[PDB]
Amino acid sequence: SIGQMTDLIHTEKDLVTSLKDYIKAEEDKLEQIKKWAEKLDRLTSTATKDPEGFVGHPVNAFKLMKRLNTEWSELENLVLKDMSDGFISNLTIQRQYFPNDEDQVGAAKALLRLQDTYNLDTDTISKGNLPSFLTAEDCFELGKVAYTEADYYHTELWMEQALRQLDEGEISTIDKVSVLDYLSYAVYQQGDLDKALLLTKKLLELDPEHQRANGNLKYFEYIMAK
Amino acid sequence: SIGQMTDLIHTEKDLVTSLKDYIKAEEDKLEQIKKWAEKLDRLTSTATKDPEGFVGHPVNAFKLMKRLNTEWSELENLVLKDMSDGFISNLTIQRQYFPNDEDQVGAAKALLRLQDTYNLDTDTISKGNLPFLTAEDCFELGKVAYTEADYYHTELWMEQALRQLDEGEISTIDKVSVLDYLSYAVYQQGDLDKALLLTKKLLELDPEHQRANGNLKYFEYIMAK
């Protein structure tokens, strides 16, 4: 539907309003804690300076003990206090009407097809180079969904975009070796052994003991030879 | 001992260091969260302008789903994260060498003793006008006295607490409770003129205080008698 998307756009907006509320909360806590800490900073720096004289006049001694017995306990209680209940409460509730895995993969598939029905370069989708933009792990996931479909066409394309972006300098949760594993395997399944070999060799240049890739190399030079 | 307190002073110095670290931790986390939030502030606002055209080109639909299914739960996980174990472990360990309630009460008594062995005015001990206590500190000392049945000191420190309140100090402690204790201590001391006086002012602040009405009637009774 479209109304569903407008409904989810709106949910996620309200959720951002909630989030920002929570941020006001944690800042307000954190600050009065900073205030508290500077107060003790002042006290504890002047007290370290002259422990005999400080502990001398017992207005200091009483303050020191009311502070260690009571104050540091309130303080501790406040550090432990939780500011996020409200926001998390909301989120837990909204999550009743969120998409699940099924819908995420559905949406990947949909993207996959709309790539080649309007016939588009993956750098031309990722980078919004047409008249929002895609992390390396996004491309990576697309390559995976594809690979699970044994769709090596798309696996090739997105694993390639994913490799391209990591090279370009995008810092990520995803490493080159996985990218190269899936890339080299999709390529091999395509028919072009010749590139599979080199890619595998890049993987090996990154991970010399990648147990799968060595076996892959042996296999490769074997089926080329034969 | 003196060295024992030197060890304590240093311990608390250390704890302040720990806490300051904790603050750096929560701030760092919060920052990453504000970051995430602003990125989504953009996305949501763009999307609301024209939901149709937006969910039109389905990279938008994909990201919207990935973000509702995966990413908001990582965000959730960040929100729930606890930056405090380091500091709280430090605290829970040091606590083994902290004073307890009895030590604190004890110190309050040591202070009451000092007040009079050097014969010193309360504003003067509080305001460190020698060559500083909050109103709740003052009240506290007052109570320790009271519990002792030391109505002398109860008198004095309830007086100082009321003094520091009227000056305009913000405190968790209200004027009426200080007045209750003060009126009563004064009465037990003997100056009944002042007990009446005070009870009256307490009533000026709370007109239906159940103890202090009967306190008014009873005081003027024993005055007249």
Swiss-Prot record, chain A:
Question: Chief subcellular site?
Answer: endoplasmic reticulum
This protein's GO CC annotations: endoplasmic reticulum; endoplasmic reticulum lumen; intracellular membrane-bounded organelle; membrane; mitochondrion; procollagen-proline 4-dioxygenase complex
Asked if the record carries the keyword NAD, the reply is no
Q: Which domain of life, per UniProt?
A: Eukaryota
Q: Name one GO biological process term.
A: collagen fibril organization
Instruction: Glycosylated residues: list them.
Output: N90
Localization (cell): Endoplasmic reticulum lumen
Which keywords has UniProt assigned to this entry? Dioxygenase, Endoplasmic reticulum, Glycoprotein, Iron, Metal-binding, Oxidoreductase, Signal, TPR repeat, Vitamin C
* Tissue localization of expression: Expressed in the heart, liver, skeletal muscle, kidney, placenta, lung and pancreas.
Spans of the TPR repeats?
177-210
Tell me what happens on changing Y219A: Strongly reduced affinity for peptide substrate
A Gene Ontology molecular function term for this protein is:
identical protein binding
Q: What's its job?
A: Catalyzes the post-translational formation of 4-hydroxyproline in -Xaa-Pro-Gly- sequences in collagens and other proteins.
Subunit-level organization: Heterotetramer of two alpha-1 chains and two beta chains (P4HB)(the beta chain is the multi-functional PDI), where P4HB plays the role of a structural subunit; this tetramer catalyzes the formation of 4-hydroxyproline in collagen.
Q: Can you tell me which family this protein belongs to?
A: Belongs to the P4HA family.
Question: What is the protein's given name?
Answer: Prolyl 4-hydroxylase subunit alpha-1
Species per Swiss-Prot/TrEMBL record: Homo sapiens
The organism that produces this protein has a lineage beginning with:
Eukaryota, Metazoa, Chordata, Craniata, Vertebrata
